[PDB]
């Protein structure tokens, strides 16, 4: 199963550092990624998380996570835990890319709020138009420049001596992404992200959960 409601599917998400060796040679490092390898028969079933367990890590009151979830639809709500690959190594570009598909032709608005102790620190808003593609519609946010705050944040994490210390900082850091149909104001996808530092040999990892009322 995947990060998909009835009306929108996020097939790709990544944050990366790209470095130019020379005008024809580029190295790319992925910090986190979903959909890097193709969807397969054996992909795991999605476990569930009771959303009341996470309310305090995200903005609340008017228009917050609780307000959004109760308005629904509930099948649009997901929690992604990333284990991020911070082992990096000329000109540098920090970027975020994502890709979505819908059966419907819509104008969508993507809001991404970076949070500390559940409170917004920076927001980024993008409006995306559809492209027709084999009887459905696709949306792409392509190599969107990562904002200064996050570039600065990544540097400061690396300048900590120990990984368990990186994990302690990350215990109070969250990101909330809300994708809405601009016309109808329907919530198409709402994705809460939480992080740890990866210790895997095979790179960055993730678990994806459905957020449920129970």
């Amino acid at each position: 199963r995947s990060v998909a409601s009835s009306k929108l599917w996020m097939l790709e998400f990544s944050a990366f550092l790209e470095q130019q060796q020379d005008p024809d040679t580029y190295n790319k490092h992925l910090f986190v990624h979903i959909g890097q390898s193709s969807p397969s028969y054996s992909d795991p079933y999605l476990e569930a998380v009771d959303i009341r367990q996470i309310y305090d890590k995200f903005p609340e009151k008017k228009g917050g996570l609780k307000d959004l979830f109760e308005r629904g639809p509930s099948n649009a709500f997901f929690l992604v835990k990333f284990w991020a690959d911070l082992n990096t190594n000329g000109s540098s570009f920090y970027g975020v890319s994502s890709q979505y598909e819908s059966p419907e032709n819509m104008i969508i608005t993507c809001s991404t709020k970076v949070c500390s102790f559940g409170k917004q620190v920076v927001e980024k808003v993008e409006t995306e138009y559809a492209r027709y593609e084999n009887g459905h519609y696709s949306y792409r946010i392509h190599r969107s420049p990562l904002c200064e705050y996050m570039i600065n944040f990544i540097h400061k994490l690396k300048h900590l001596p120990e990984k368990y210390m990186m994990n302690s900082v990350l215990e109070n850091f969250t990101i909330l992404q809300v994708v809405t149909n601009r016309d109808t104001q329907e919530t198409l996808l709402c994705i809460a992200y939480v992080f740890e530092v990866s210790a895997s040999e095979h790179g960055a990892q993730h678990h994806i959960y459905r957020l449920v009322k129970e």
Partner: peptide, 15 residues
């Protein structure tokens, strides 16, 4: 604390 909340075991086990 995060580690004591009700969440699946997979949440504290990197794949």
């Amino acid at each position: 604390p995060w580690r004591l909340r009700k969440x699946p075991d997979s949440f504290a086990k990197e794949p």
